[PDB]
Design a protein around this nucleic acid. Structure first.
Ligand code: MG
Ligand code: MG
Ligand code: MG
Ligand code: MG
Ligand code: MG
Ligand code: MG
Ligand code: MG
Ligand code: MG
Ligand code: MG
Ligand code: MG
Ligand code: MG
Ligand code: MG
Ligand code: MG
Ligand code: MG
Ligand code: MG
Ligand code: MG
Lengths: 132, 99, 208, 132, 198, 101
RNA sequence: GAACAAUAGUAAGCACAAUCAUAGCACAUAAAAACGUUAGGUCAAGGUGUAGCUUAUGGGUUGGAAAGAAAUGGGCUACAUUUUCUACAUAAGAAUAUCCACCACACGAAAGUUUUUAUGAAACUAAAAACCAAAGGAGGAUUUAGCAGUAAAUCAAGAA
């Protein structure tokens, strides 16, 4: 049985995001790519760099906004700037959200030496595609 | 092959800036060596790794400044606390064997 | 099976399509063929509308072919037909008017007749009964028999020739010897027939 | 074969010129047109050649620079395929010897087919009528 | 008749196979009697019409070019080989493939016979003059390609009935058979690595 | 921390090998040449075999960058086969997808 | 816990199915394939529970890791004539274990010996020459694969 990136069937109560309900063989068919950048195209360079950068961003964001991250991150890279886009549960007061927006954007901008944008979309509770 | 052809060729090399005088197959390697970027100098090589020290250090500090939250390190901690409580800890250096 | 079961085999015969007006049931039949909006498999490269191609010669060609070489096997067949031809033209001019009326010079008819003579009547299948394997006389289908003939020809004229000797030579020899019934191939056919008489009692074990 | 390249080799494995051959060196002198009372009728070939491509039938290609330059003004006679009459005559000659043993070779059909498959080339036609 | 799916959509209700069967059988009983007007109208909700069934080909309009009369075009594709064939009705029999004679380009008898097939089939064997461009594949694949293309080109010159004949000889259909992809963990796209029982 | 001591070793190796690249090149120029006399080349030989042993490039290993796996690496992402699959199967590798054909 | 001329079963969900891919259909192939089964495989991908080491079961440097009594699996090349060599696309020329008195000698050398070359700080590694030309003459019991562009044979490219 393939197990990769799967959410197994429970007794039938389990809430499952649109993302988690689709096994890897559905990529580019039904669900799309959680990142976008030029690097993996035919004649292009520095794929490796962008991969590591990506991994660090998911980890970092997950730790910077504890408990409030709804679904996995979306990373768009365009002409030297990265727009991070996130689905966020409403947990914190908007004070904490703006504090973390600014803190993050500046921090990562100085880390990766490129302009970083952060776009928060706010959601009452984890959007539910299936079971439940 | 003629003398005319060889004079022409010599002129072609001298002009386009390739090797003028006749060389061995074995010696041309020298030119190759300076034409290129030596392997250990390519960014794909010396820059291969991310600096793991900077990532680990920076995110550690940012944890202590209470910005970043590391659940892995937290897990490690709580496990360890419960382990020293149960009585099996890490021996202070030098103590364990002989005692 | 890049063709669905929907696809019918093509009919290559030109004579069939050229002269329709005299047959009612067949007019109705190929009417139902095309008008059924019936799909047709694309006519294979081997088969042609050629007035010159004998499906038996082509089968034999194929059974001779090792690896992917049609070119080489079609060569050997062509050369063999030419060799039988010239062997009989040799036997014709050194003969007298009577034997010039008797002797066959068509290599095609010689091929066919030599196969008809070499095809077995009856055959043997092993049957397990009471923990023993008995060899039992079995009637054979037509196709099985033709196959046995061709395969026996080729097996012999591959196996038993001296390494100096070329294939079209040995094959033309055995074709002509099987034409007259004295070939080793025919001896094989008889060995089968005799093994089938020796066991005739066991013909009861066959349940079909 | 006189001015071409040679396959034969010394024990040194080093190839030898056609000049190096006594037979060729002397057979070259016979073509030089220095003499009276004689005529030299030559044929430039493919089928037996060396180092020439299979599709080259033309005199200067087969003879090369050495060949054509040392061959002097000569008469370039072209040999082509059977025309309709030549062809029909050859077929009739085969039928007279009853060398076409195929039942349907006496039809007009058989002639159209042999004409097409052989392109009424003599050697090709012989090959096609040999196994027929 | 409607499919079960359609009926199921018309009642806004799930159905069973035996259900659908029952109903259809009943409509059959109905139509097998004298049909009233309201009855005909009734059973005709449950009709659908299957769309056009004709397999007749689409004849290429014949073409007249630069004072030259009657040339037709066709394009075959077989197995990595593409072939474009232009045929002239006004010419004598010969065939030029990639600028050379067809006896030179197709040394093998079998391929020449393949090229011969459609002409010999229509008895056009002396009457037409063709130029070809064939690329890719091997020799036999190219012969096949030109075969198909030639066949498709000669449909302009012939009668509508002989077109049906060529189709029924399998002259006009592309050959779908193509190389299968090798599969990982096997050897040959079918051939398996040797299997050891013990 | 690099994930493993081995990785550490490798980092050092790449540093040293970067540092001495110029010396190594300049000397192996002499060494690889037929034109110069053999007497220069034997001295140059001892010269380059004098250099620290961890400065020579053949001693480098391309290792998985996250997981430190020594082989089963795909050069383009500098990733172990396992980690590569783990990222691609969550769709975090842009333009990578399972292959059907 | 079914019987359709129907007798107690409705059921959402997941699988199958359908769709998607292989650049048009179709077919094929690919992909997919739940719940579980084998305490199946992997603490040496990484991470980890429990238990262990801590001037060592940790971290470095230098050099070594041999080898073939024997048994065996999977491959490669063969044992030749549907062959071998050369030219060359598929019509050629020659060779052809036997000739004969005498050697010499066919197919097979991928193996070894010598000399070179590539890569490398390091040649033991790979490649090309020349020499050498052995076993092998189509294989016991028993066994593997393949349903069509498949098997078979031939060619090429890539990953590291
Ligand atoms: Mg195969
Ligand atoms: Mg570790
Ligand atoms: Mg290495
Ligand atoms: Mg249910
Ligand atoms: Mg599709
Ligand atoms: Mg399907
Ligand atoms: Mg599968
Ligand atoms: Mg499915
Ligand atoms: Mg176990
Ligand atoms: Mg184990
Ligand atoms: Mg561990
Ligand atoms: Mg072994
Ligand atoms: Mg294996
Ligand atoms: Mg030999
Ligand atoms: Mg060989
Ligand atoms: Mg060296």
């Amino acid at each position: 049985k393939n197990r990769a990136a799967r959410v197994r069937v429970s007794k039938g109560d389990k809430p499952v995001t649109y993302e988690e309900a689709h096994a890897p063989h559905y990529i580019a068919h039904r669900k799309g790519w959680l990142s976008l950048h030029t690097g993996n195209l035919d004649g292009e360079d520095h794929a490796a760099e962008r991969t590591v950068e990506d991994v660090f961003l998911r980890k970092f964001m997950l730790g910077t906004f504890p408990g409030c991250l709804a679904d996995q991150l979306v990373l768009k890279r365009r002409a030297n700037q990265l727009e991070i886009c996130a689905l966020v549960l409403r947990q914190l007061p908007p004070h904490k959200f703006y504090f973390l927006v600014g803190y993050s954007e500046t921090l990562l901008s100085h880390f990766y030496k490129c302009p970083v944008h952060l776009h928060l979309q706010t959601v009452p509770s984890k959007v539910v595609y299936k079971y439940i | 092959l003629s003398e005319y052809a060889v004079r022409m060729s010599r002129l072609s090399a001298r002009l386009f800036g390739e090797v003028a005088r006749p060389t061995d197959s074995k010696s041309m390697k020298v030119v190759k060596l300076f034409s290129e970027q030596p392997l250990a100098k390519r960014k794909e090589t010396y820059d291969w790794y991310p600096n793991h020290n900077t990532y680990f250090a920076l995110m550690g500090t940012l944890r202590f400044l209470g910005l970043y939250r590391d659940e892995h390190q937290d897990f490690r901690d709580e496990q360890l606390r419960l382990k020293k409580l149960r009585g099996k800890g890490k021996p202070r250096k030098g103590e364990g064997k002989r005692a | 099976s890049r063709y669905g079961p929907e696809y019918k085999d093509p009919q290559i015969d030109k004579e069939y399509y050229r002269k329709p007006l005299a047959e009612q049931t067949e007019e109705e039949k190929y009417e139902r063929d095309f008008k059924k909006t019936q799909l047709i498999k694309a006519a294979p490269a081997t088969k042609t509308s050629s007035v010159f191609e004998d499906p038996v010669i082509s089968k034999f060609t194929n059974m001779m072919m090792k690896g992917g070489n049609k070119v080489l096997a079609r060569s050997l067949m062509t050369q063999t037909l030419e060799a039988v031809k010239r062997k009989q033209f040799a036997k014709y001019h050194a003969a007298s008017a009577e034997e010039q009326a008797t002797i066959e010079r068509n290599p095609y008819t010689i091929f066919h007749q030599a196969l008809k003579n070499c095809e077995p009547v009856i055959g043997l299948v092993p049957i397990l009964k009471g923990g023993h394997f008995y060899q039992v006389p079995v009637p054979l289908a037509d196709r099985r028999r033709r196959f046995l003939a061709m395969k026996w020809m080729i097996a012999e004229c591959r196996e038993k020739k001296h390494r100096r000797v070329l294939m079209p030579e040995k094959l033309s020899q055995e074709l002509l010897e099987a034409f007259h019934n004295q070939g080793p191939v025919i001896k094989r056919k008889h060995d089968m027939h005799k093994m089938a008489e020796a066991n005739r009692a066991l013909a009861h074990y066959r349940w079909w | 074969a006189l001015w071409g390249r040679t396959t034969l080799k010394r024990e040194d494995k080093s190839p030898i010129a056609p000049e190096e051959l006594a037979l060729i060196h002397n057979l070259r002198k016979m073509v030089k047109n220095d003499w009276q009372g004689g005529a030299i009728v030559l044929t430039v070939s493919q089928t037996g050649s060396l180092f020439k491509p299979r599709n080259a039938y033309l005199p200067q290609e087969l003879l090369g620079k050495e060949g054509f330059d040392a061959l002097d003004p000569f008469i370039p006679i072209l040999v082509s395929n059977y025309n309709p009459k030549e062809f029909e005559s050859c077929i009739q000659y085969y039928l007279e010897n009853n060398w076409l043993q195929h039942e349907k070779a006496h039809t007009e059909e058989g002639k159209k087919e042999l004409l097409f498959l052989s392109n009424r080339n003599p050697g090709q036609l012989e090959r096609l009528c040999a196994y027929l | 008749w409607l499919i079960k799916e359609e009926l199921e959509e018309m009642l806004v209700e799930k159905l069973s196979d035996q259900d659908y069967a029952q109903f259809i059988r009943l409509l059959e009983r109905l139509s097998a009697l004298p049909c009233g007007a309201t009855e005909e109208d009734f059973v005709n909700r449950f009709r659908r019409s299957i769309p056009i069934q004709s397999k007749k080909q689409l004849i290429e309009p014949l073409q007249y070019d630069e004072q030259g009369m009657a040339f037709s075009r066709g394009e075959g594709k077989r197995k990595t080989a593409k072939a474009e064939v232009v045929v002239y009705g006004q010419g004598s029999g010969r065939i030029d493939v990639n600028g050379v004679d067809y006896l030179l380009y197709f040394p093998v008898t079998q391929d020449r016979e393949q090229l011969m097939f459609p002409l010999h089939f229509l008895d056009r064997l002396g009457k037409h003059d063709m130029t070809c461009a064939v690329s890719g594949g091997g020799r036999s694949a190219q012969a096949g390609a030109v075969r198909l293309a030639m066949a498709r080109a000669l449909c302009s010159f012939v009668t509508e009935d002989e077109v049906e004949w060529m189709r029924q000889a399998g002259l006009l259909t592309a050959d779908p058979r193509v190389r299968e992809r090798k599969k990982p963990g096997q050897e040959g796209a079918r051939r398996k690595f040797t299997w050891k029982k013990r | 921390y690099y994930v493993d001591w081995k990785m550490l070793r490798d980092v050092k190796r790449r540093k040293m090998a970067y540092e001495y690249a110029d010396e190594r090149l300049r000397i192996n120029s002499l060494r690889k040449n037929t034109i110069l006399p053999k007497d220069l080349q034997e001295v140059a030989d001892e010269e380059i075999a004098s250099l620290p042993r961890d400065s020579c490039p053949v001693r480098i290993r391309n290792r998985c960058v996250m997981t430190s796996r020594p082989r089963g690496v795909k050069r383009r992402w500098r990733l172990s086969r396992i980690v590569f699959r783990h990222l691609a199967d969550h769709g975090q590798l842009s333009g990578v997808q399972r292959a059907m054909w």
